[PDB]
Amino acid sequence: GAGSIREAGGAFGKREQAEEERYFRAQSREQLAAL
Amino acid sequence: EMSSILEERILGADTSVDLEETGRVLSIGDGIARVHGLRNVQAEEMVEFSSGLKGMSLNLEPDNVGVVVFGNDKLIKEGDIVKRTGAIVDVPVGEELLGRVVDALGNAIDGKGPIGSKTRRRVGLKAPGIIPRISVREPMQTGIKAVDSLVPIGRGQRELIIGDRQTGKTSIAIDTIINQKRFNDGSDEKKKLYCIYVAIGQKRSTVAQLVKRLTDADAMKYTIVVSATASDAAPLQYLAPYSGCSMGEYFRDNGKHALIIYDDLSKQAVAYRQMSLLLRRPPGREAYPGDVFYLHSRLLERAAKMNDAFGGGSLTALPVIETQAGDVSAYIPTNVISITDGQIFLETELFYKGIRPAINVGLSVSRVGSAAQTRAMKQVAGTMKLELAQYREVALLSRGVRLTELLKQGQYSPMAIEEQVAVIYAGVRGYLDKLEPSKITKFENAFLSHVVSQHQALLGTIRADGKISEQSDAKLKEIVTNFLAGF
Amino acid sequence: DLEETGRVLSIGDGIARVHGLRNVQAEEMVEFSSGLKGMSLNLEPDNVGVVVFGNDKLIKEGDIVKRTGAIVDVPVGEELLGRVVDALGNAIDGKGPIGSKTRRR
Amino acid sequence: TGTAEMSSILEERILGVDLEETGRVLSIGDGIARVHGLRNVQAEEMVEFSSGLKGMSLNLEPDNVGVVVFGNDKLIKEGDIVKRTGAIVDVPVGEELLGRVVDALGNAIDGKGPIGSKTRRR
Amino acid sequence: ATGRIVAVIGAVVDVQFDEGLPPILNALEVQGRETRLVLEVAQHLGESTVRTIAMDGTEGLVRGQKVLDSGAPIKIPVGPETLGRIMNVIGEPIDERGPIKTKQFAPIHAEAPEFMEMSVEQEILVTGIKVVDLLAPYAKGGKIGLFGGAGVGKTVLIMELINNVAKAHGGYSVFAGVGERTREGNDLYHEMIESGVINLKDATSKVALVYGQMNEPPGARARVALTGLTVAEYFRDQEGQDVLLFIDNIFRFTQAGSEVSALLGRIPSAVGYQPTLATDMGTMQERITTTKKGSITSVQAIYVPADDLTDPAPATTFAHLDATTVLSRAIAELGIYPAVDPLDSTSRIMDPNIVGSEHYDVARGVQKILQDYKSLQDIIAILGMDELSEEDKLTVSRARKIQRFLSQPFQVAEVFTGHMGKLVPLKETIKGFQQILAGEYDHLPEQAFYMVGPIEEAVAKADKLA
Amino acid sequence: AATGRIVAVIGAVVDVQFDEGLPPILNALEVQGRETRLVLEVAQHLGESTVRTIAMDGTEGLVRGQKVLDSGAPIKIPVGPETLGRIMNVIGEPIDERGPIKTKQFAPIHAEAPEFMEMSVEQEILVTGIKVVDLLAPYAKGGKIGLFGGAGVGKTVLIMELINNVAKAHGGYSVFAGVGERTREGNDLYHEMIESGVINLKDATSKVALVYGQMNEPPGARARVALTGLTVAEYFRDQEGQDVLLFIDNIFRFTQAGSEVSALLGRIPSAVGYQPTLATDMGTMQERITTTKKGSITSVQAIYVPADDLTDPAPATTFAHLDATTVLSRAIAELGIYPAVDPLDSTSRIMDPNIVGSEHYDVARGVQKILQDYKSLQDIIAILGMDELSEEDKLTVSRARKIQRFLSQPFQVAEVFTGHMGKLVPLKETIKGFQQILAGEYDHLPEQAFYMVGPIEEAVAKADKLAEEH
Amino acid sequence: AKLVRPPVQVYGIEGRYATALYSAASKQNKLEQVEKELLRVAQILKEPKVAASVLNPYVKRSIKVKSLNDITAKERFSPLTTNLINLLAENGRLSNTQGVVSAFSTMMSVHRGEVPCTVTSASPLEEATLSELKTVLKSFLSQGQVLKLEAKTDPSILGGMIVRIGEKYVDMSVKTKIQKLGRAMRE
Amino acid sequence: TLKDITRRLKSIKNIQKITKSMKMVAAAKYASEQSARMTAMDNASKNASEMIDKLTLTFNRTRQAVITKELIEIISGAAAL
Numbered sequence A: 001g002a003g004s005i006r007e008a009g010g011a012f013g014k015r016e017q018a019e020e021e022r023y024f025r026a027q028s029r030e031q032l033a034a035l
Numbered sequence B: 001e002m003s004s005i006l007e008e009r010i011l012g013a014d015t016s017v018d019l020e021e022t023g024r025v026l027s028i029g030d031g032i033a034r035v036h037g038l039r040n041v042q043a044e045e046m047v048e049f050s051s052g053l054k055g056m057s058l059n060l061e062p063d064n065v066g067v068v069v070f071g072n073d074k075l076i077k078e079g080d081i082v083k084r085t086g087a088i089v090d091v092p093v094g095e096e097l098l099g100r101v102v103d104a105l106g107n108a109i110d111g112k113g114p115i116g117s118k119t120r121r122r123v124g125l126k127a128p129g130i131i132p133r134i135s136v137r138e139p140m141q142t143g144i145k146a147v148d149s150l151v152p153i154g155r156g157q158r159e160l161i162i163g164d165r166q167t168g169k170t171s172i173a174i175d176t177i178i179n180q181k182r183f184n185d186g187s188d189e190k191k192k193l194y195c196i197y198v199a200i201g202q203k204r205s206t207v208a209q210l211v212k213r214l215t216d217a218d219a220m221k222y223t224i225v226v227s228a229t230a231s232d233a234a235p236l237q238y239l240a241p242y243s244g245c246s247m248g249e250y251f252r253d254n255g256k257h258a259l260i261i262y263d264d265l266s267k268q269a270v271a272y273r274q275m276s277l278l279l280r281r282p283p284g285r286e287a288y289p290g291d292v293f294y295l296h297s298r299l300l301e302r303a304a305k306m307n308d309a310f311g312g313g314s315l316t317a318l319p320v321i322e323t324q325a326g327d328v329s330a331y332i333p334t335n336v337i338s339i340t341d342g343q344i345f346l347e348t349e350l351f352y353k354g355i356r357p358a359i360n361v362g363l364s365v366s367r368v369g370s371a372a373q374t375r376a377m378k379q380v381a382g383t384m385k386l387e388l389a390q391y392r393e394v395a396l397l398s399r400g401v402r403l404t405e406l407l408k409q410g411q412y413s414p415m416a417i418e419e420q421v422a423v424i425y426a427g428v429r430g431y432l433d434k435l436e437p438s439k440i441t442k443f444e445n446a447f448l449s450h451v452v453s454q455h456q457a458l459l460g461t462i463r464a465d466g467k468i469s470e471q472s473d474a475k476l477k478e479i480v481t482n483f484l485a486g487f
Numbered sequence C: 001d002l003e004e005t006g007r008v009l010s011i012g013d014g015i016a017r018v019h020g021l022r023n024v025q026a027e028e029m030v031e032f033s034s035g036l037k038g039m040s041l042n043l044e045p046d047n048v049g050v051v052v053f054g055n056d057k058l059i060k061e062g063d064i065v066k067r068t069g070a071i072v073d074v075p076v077g078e079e080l081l082g083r084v085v086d087a088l089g090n091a092i093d094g095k096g097p098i099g100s101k102t103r104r105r
Numbered sequence D: 001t002g003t004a005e006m007s008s009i010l011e012e013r014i015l016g017v018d019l020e021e022t023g024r025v026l027s028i029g030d031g032i033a034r035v036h037g038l039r040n041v042q043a044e045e046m047v048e049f050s051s052g053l054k055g056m057s058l059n060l061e062p063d064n065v066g067v068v069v070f071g072n073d074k075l076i077k078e079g080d081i082v083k084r085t086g087a088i089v090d091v092p093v094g095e096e097l098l099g100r101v102v103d104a105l106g107n108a109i110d111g112k113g114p115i116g117s118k119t120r121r122r
Numbered sequence E: 001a002t003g004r005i006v007a008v009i010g011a012v013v014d015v016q017f018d019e020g021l022p023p024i025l026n027a028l029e030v031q032g033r034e035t036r037l038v039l040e041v042a043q044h045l046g047e048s049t050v051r052t053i054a055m056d057g058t059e060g061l062v063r064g065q066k067v068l069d070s071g072a073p074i075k076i077p078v079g080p081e082t083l084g085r086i087m088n089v090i091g092e093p094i095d096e097r098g099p100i101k102t103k104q105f106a107p108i109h110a111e112a113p114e115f116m117e118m119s120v121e122q123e124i125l126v127t128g129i130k131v132v133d134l135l136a137p138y139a140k141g142g143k144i145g146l147f148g149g150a151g152v153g154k155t156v157l158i159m160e161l162i163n164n165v166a167k168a169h170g171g172y173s174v175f176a177g178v179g180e181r182t183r184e185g186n187d188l189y190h191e192m193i194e195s196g197v198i199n200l201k202d203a204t205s206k207v208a209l210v211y212g213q214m215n216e217p218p219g220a221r222a223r224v225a226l227t228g229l230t231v232a233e234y235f236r237d238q239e240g241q242d243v244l245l246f247i248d249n250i251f252r253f254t255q256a257g258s259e260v261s262a263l264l265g266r267i268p269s270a271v272g273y274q275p276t277l278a279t280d281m282g283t284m285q286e287r288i289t290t291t292k293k294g295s296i297t298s299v300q301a302i303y304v305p306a307d308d309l310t311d312p313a314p315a316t317t318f319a320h321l322d323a324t325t326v327l328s329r330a331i332a333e334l335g336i337y338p339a340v341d342p343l344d345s346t347s348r349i350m351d352p353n354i355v356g357s358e359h360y361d362v363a364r365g366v367q368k369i370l371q372d373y374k375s376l377q378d379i380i381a382i383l384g385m386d387e388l389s390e391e392d393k394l395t396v397s398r399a400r401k402i403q404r405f406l407s408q409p410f411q412v413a414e415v416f417t418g419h420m421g422k423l424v425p426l427k428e429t430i431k432g433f434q435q436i437l438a439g440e441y442d443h444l445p446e447q448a449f450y451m452v453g454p455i456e457e458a459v460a461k462a463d464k465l466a
Numbered sequence F: 001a002a003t004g005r006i007v008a009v010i011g012a013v014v015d016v017q018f019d020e021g022l023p024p025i026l027n028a029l030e031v032q033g034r035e036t037r038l039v040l041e042v043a044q045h046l047g048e049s050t051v052r053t054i055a056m057d058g059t060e061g062l063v064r065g066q067k068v069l070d071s072g073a074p075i076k077i078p079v080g081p082e083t084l085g086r087i088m089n090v091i092g093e094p095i096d097e098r099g100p101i102k103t104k105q106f107a108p109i110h111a112e113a114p115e116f117m118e119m120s121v122e123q124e125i126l127v128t129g130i131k132v133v134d135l136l137a138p139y140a141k142g143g144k145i146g147l148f149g150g151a152g153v154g155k156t157v158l159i160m161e162l163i164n165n166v167a168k169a170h171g172g173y174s175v176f177a178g179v180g181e182r183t184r185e186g187n188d189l190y191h192e193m194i195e196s197g198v199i200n201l202k203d204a205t206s207k208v209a210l211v212y213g214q215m216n217e218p219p220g221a222r223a224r225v226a227l228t229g230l231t232v233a234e235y236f237r238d239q240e241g242q243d244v245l246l247f248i249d250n251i252f253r254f255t256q257a258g259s260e261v262s263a264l265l266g267r268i269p270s271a272v273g274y275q276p277t278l279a280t281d282m283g284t285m286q287e288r289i290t291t292t293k294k295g296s297i298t299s300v301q302a303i304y305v306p307a308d309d310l311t312d313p314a315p316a317t318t319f320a321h322l323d324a325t326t327v328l329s330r331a332i333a334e335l336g337i338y339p340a341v342d343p344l345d346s347t348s349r350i351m352d353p354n355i356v357g358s359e360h361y362d363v364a365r366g367v368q369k370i371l372q373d374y375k376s377l378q379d380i381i382a383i384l385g386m387d388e389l390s391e392e393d394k395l396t397v398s399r400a401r402k403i404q405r406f407l408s409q410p411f412q413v414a415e416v417f418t419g420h421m422g423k424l425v426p427l428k429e430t431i432k433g434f435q436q437i438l439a440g441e442y443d444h445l446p447e448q449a450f451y452m453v454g455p456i457e458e459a460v461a462k463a464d465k466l467a468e469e470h
Numbered sequence G: 001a002k003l004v005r006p007p008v009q010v011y012g013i014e015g016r017y018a019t020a021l022y023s024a025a026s027k028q029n030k031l032e033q034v035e036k037e038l039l040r041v042a043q044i045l046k047e048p049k050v051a052a053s054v055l056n057p058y059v060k061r062s063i064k065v066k067s068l069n070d071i072t073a074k075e076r077f078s079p080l081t082t083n084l085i086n087l088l089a090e091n092g093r094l095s096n097t098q099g100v101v102s103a104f105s106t107m108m109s110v111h112r113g114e115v116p117c118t119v120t121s122a123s124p125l126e127e128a129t130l131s132e133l134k135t136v137l138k139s140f141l142s143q144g145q146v147l148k149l150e151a152k153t154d155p156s157i158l159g160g161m162i163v164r165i166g167e168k169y170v171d172m173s174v175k176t177k178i179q180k181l182g183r184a185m186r187e
Numbered sequence H: 001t002l003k004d005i006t007r008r009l010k011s012i013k014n015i016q017k018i019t020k021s022m023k024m025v026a027a028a029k030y031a032s033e034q035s036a037r038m039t040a041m042d043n044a045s046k047n048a049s050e051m052i053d054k055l056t057l058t059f060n061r062t063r064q065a066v067i068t069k070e071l072i073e074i075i076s077g078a079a080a081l
């Protein structure tokens, strides 16, 4: 049952997605500035 | 008046007698009559009982004919005579049905007299094939911001409205019907949309409320309301969507554009299941007959956009489906979802969280897409769609909140496409992130009031050319900037 | 005499189809030739469906079913106090029969 | 009512063939042939249709035999003649089958010739 | 016309007629019975045989027993003489007070009112119940439905509504007890006698009672709702009166239809129900309506089997109602009474142009905060309360205060709770919930809002706890 | 021939009684006295000289005692070159209003499957230009492909993209069979093919035959139209040796039509309401769609998955009949990634290092492994957040997100949906790009740069431009 | 073998056995002989002795088959009807004997060209008027057709006459006229 | 719905395993905020186990109901022939 927290689309699957996008939108801004 | 009864109400009555071909009721019960005889009756032919009741012959069997009664089986006894009418079931069609409330067979139930209809049309006609059609290009304007921007509908499309009970489906249909008044009184004849509301298995007072709303907004003058309510026989509720579709096919074939709402197809499926189980046809999944998909498929294929050689008319279909506890995966919901050209998903959680209309933009799709939008709406709505998707991903966030609060809309308030373009523009260009989310609705109210009061020039320009050109772009730029400064 | 007496047509599934018993009432107690009792459940144009109060092993096709004329009733009264009876009111504690004066549906 | 109560059987009995080792298809559909007669056939016995298709007697009923068809339904029509083979289904066995691709009845489907086995087994 | 019984299977009886086959829905009288055994013709089977449904027990019926045809459906006494009396499914008095001497009789099977008779006016009906009046207000002349599983408070709520509306009502009232407890009918009868709403000595009675309860065979349980309908329809049409019709329980109509459909020879539908569930329900429900000849405000308790709202019977009833009060077992286990689910109860007059923008905004804000709390429930359950924002904690606290303040002590519930009942005006409800939403009581504990009337009692209880 | 009479009409099922000469099962019968052609296909012999038939069109207006004529053969359609550029229905009539299809031979739509000795074991990759398909589950020349997906995930768009790419890259008489799908889509496909030169209305150098039985058709027509298209393709394969492309959208409708007529044919229902004969019907139809030694048939089938189940008996029974299954996930379509192919659910029989090479196989397996590890790390992200992971876990997540983005590709047939222009990416370009993203050659570029591009050069260019603006 | 279908079709057990006997007798053109022998069988079994003997389901099948063969030989019956009664006795369809006889009888009645004509009237109708009615109703028939008229009286039709010639039907009652005029006035 | 319940069961089983591992890791790193995290993850695992038990009861109930419903559909289809 891997990735079954996000696949169930609950309050935890939305919390996970919000984290991945927040962390990687900050990384992409820090990676495009240098780029 | 004793002259309105003897003029020709008596002298002209078709007094002639005919040599009829008849059967004889073997048994009757639950609205199914088994009829002996009727040797030359056709499948799906309308027959007539000695009590004035009408029926349709559905089961042609070696020893009997199974007839479904279009009324109350209380007036039918064993041994009654069943006459042939020689005709497959058909209904009156034409422009005389506009403004009238009729039942599933076309008899006026609004107490305004007979429909002066000269044309009749079978209810079970075949849909147009590949050749007579052409791609869906003309936009069907609903007046709803979320629909007209993110789930656009073209003329000739089948867009499903699906959701639980009391999520706002009939409200979407009625807003769409009310919206067409701007075009139906105008001079552009190819922009007029004649509406058709089929009420299937509803409470009769609900249909009365709906006709009241449609008469208040002066929408009844171009609307036909077909009503097969909860006390009507299951054959009538089975047959009402096809009668409405025939009334709309008339316009589709005469170069005009029509819109039909089936509210709802779940109750038609239920009535068909009743007729089938009482005709002793074996049940399938959830006791539904095996061909319930065919039931809805042969109906929803008759919505089509025609090419120029066939008039250029169209018929748009907005079927409604009610799901139980949000189970989109049920039998009839999945059937109708696989049939149509897209779905508008409504949710109870979104409804109570303040999002009204409770459209789920994540799930709501329009397989026609931007192909049937105006260029101005497309320009603003591609950006709005992308930004709302990103907001859903990270739920910038304040712009997304502004956009969602801008998608909210009141009931019975269908906006013009130019005004929608103006508000989406004001929200998508940044002139609302200064404002706190709570006051967006009244900012919008005052904004459109001001704009329609003082800027008919820009709105008329957007209306005529269809796009927001850089001239008018800068114009509404300064207009909204000035207003936000004054706000 | 197929008016107060019938013959078992079929037995199995706890229901005995009985031919005859033309004067039997609905929900009436019948008595099988084996000593078992039943209840008339379905009066039909050509048979009587009887709910057997006991094992179907004891009832065969062709057995005689007499009707007792009484809708299903049990012995009642003070004479049942201290007794262990089965669902039909027959004593199963070996203390002899119930001396009841009254029956009740 | 009744599989063998077809009008042809009844009128032939009213007017007044070997119904022991031979039968006649009363009805055929979806791979199931209801066969009249065959009063000596055994349960799970292989039978023979007139078109050459084989079957297996799975349902022995009071007035018909339910036969499953080892092939296509189109080669069987109502009134076709069914024969007994007198044997339960059996396949060939032995070392002669090593290296062969056979079907569910031990018939070679690789074109390398007939299985030269000497032994059969139920 | 006289026929003879040819088959008896439960409540279903086949009757074969030599002459004069009776129409469908006609009432037949069995000869040779101690009491009146009425059969209602349901189907014509062919070969001059009909299939009927018995309105009483069929024990003792013999094949060949004679049956007379009445020539008309079941006809009950209608009129002002039925007020204060109790009658059963076939209109016979069951209160031991002699014959109901009305001057007319009406068949219990009638056509639904036409489309041109419908009435569209939607004035509110204040009930004194905070959750009902706030979130799903009732309308005069409308159809109210109270959904709920076993033991959640449908009878308590309908008795509270009888107490809060029917005594203050100016017109007549009809209570149809359909397939419920007989002792509840006895309780209601005697309570109405002491409260003066029924008068045994003169003609000032204001309520007519019709009872076919859960000890009755399925035919009586299937037609007693129609008998109550007929009484209310007489009061609405021939008197032009405003009528109050209470039906408890209306699910038993469908359940009895299912029980008899088993034996009428019909292929079962989903969950074993009759294939005619929706059209039977519609034929019955369309007669319970306000026409432009008179008004019927209708309150119906709908049983929900095994707490499954998706069951065909409640799911079909949902479409016939203007206001639905959905009681929840999960809410009743939190001690909140009435157990109304605030995010599942709806009303059609919950519209700013009907209830005003203040009422509408307060209701919508309450529902928003309750939905937000429900969304947070998973995180609150696993990761505890402390892993939330401060705004989420504020939302949770306000939502819990609002949940408590939706509860209310009833006057019919005093006997087993001791708290005196409260009848909260609509103004006080809107004010209290506006104030809680504002935060004016974020300092009081949530347990101070539990089981109070107006918000002043909430602050008094908070002052008495500290 | 034999003449019978209609004795019963219940829906789309018609019983016919014959006095002389009962027709065999699967024969086509002509109903006499009808303005349009109504064909009845014999299904069962009921006894009493009666057959039970399924109607290929509507049964309204049929009378008991109406005469029926036996054709003496199954449904026979025109086959040959003259079918190219035409649209025919289930019974072989032209429905494009361009006159009769004058061919030299007709073929019955019911035929036996090829024998075991007729099979071919050759497996050569068919490059499509789609990155996810080429890399993770490549197609084979002359193999059966199959595209699984629920409603609205992209089966039609993907099959039109494959039509575009392969069918114009091809020179061998494609066939498209529209089985129980939307008529608007059929008109759209017809006009795209007329516009793109694949169908030639004048100067008949057309290279696609069209067969259409759509949703509005009765269940018999939707159950036999796949066999009609199959028969056209079979003629092209066998009696010309040509290499054929067969496109079927949607093949679930064949099974669904079977189930719609099942109960009226007197058959006890099976599981999920399907006919008892689901597997054998699917097998007798699918075993004819195959490459023999006589010629090649590359088959691409769209397979509808009801309610996104994939354990439903119809898709579950279709799975074993394919050589490269491509599974479209709604969860991936909701991420904005298109095509919505599921990388951890799509399988190919030529994903073998002894067929495609060790570089391609290793890159595909590494992509799938990093995506599975990403699936597992998402749990710990959900509980802990992204900041409390190890640095190598963050590297895995970053590379996995980049591989997800780079699996998406803009289609030529989706410019109206996407706005972006189409890209057709070679096989070695795909392998090289994914090998580089796996090796870590772009941990400096942002993840959005890989989304909706072609090869990896487009990725670096997009990254450069985003850096310029942002 | 090919079976000869009768002019009218009856269904069920009775219909199948009657169609069988009809084809088997038209094979030997003995329709009237077997018709009257079936009438004799039907009156033989209906008398309570044989009825109670053969409708008894616990007495063995072969015993009643032997008794039926006895009683059909004793009365000098054709081999056709004899093995017909034997067939009804083996299949256990003796209960359906009267139904088989009735189906065969209506088959042979329509084979004689007898059409069932019903003439409903408000009052007992005049006899010379009824003979003129017969003469006029013979005009709706093909040749080889005879009218089997049975006129029952329904007083609620208020006058006129409702005639049913097989499946043809003319509603000349006056109540139909008044109902049409009422529908015309209201609509 | 059976698939919704299975999704939720899988999700909460994963949450329970993760919080148990986090509790062990905090127990190692604790050998005042580490103690709080250890007890908090212990409580989260306990609550997740209780939700898992209730959902397992609901899942078994729903799968029994689904088997019964499909059987009843097959039976009713066979009885109508």
Ligand SMILES: Nc1ncnc2c1ncn2[C@@H]1O[C@H](COP(=O)(O)OP(=O)(O)OP(=O)(O)O)[C@@H](O)[C@H]1O
Pocket: B164, B165, B166, B167, B168, B169, B170, B171, B172, B356, B357, B358, B409, B410, B411, E319, E347, E348, E350, E351
């Ligand atoms: N856009 C909206 N804004 C505010 N309120 C709305 C909106 N749409 C609907 N409502 C209200 O929510 C309720 C939903 O009723 P509605 O008839 O529109 O939906 P429905 O799906 O047809 O419900 P049902 O079929 O069960 O009667 C209505 O009271 C309506 O007034």
Ligand SMILES: Nc1ncnc2c1ncn2[C@@H]1O[C@H](COP(=O)(O)OP(=O)(O)O)[C@@H](O)[C@H]1O
Pocket: E148, E149, E150, E151, E152, E153, E154, E155, E156, E157, E337, E338, E410, E413, E417
């Ligand atoms: N408003 C209420 N206040 C307190 N308890 C209540 C209330 N309503 C119901 N209950 C509890 O539920 C019990 C039974 O409720 P009841 O009226 O019988 O509902 P139902 O008819 O659905 O079974 C009551 O005895 C009481 O314990």
Ligand SMILES: Nc1ncnc2c1ncn2[C@@H]1O[C@H](COP(=O)(O)OP(=O)(O)O)[C@@H](O)[C@H]1O
Pocket: B365, B366, B367, B368, B369, F149, F150, F151, F152, F153, F154, F155, F156, F157, F158, F338, F339, F411, F414, F417, F418
């Ligand atoms: N490759 C794609 N690129 C962009 N959007 C797509 C793509 N495929 C599908 N879509 C979107 O999903 C919708 C569904 O398209 P479709 O091919 O008809 O799916 P299906 O046939 O499986 O129901 C399309 O209208 C489109 O909006």
Ligand SMILES: [Mg+2]
Pocket: B169, B170
């Ligand atoms: Mg609605």
Ligand SMILES: [Mg+2]
Pocket: E154, E155, E180
């Ligand atoms: Mg109660």
Ligand SMILES: [Mg+2]
Pocket: F155, F156, F181
């Ligand atoms: Mg598609």
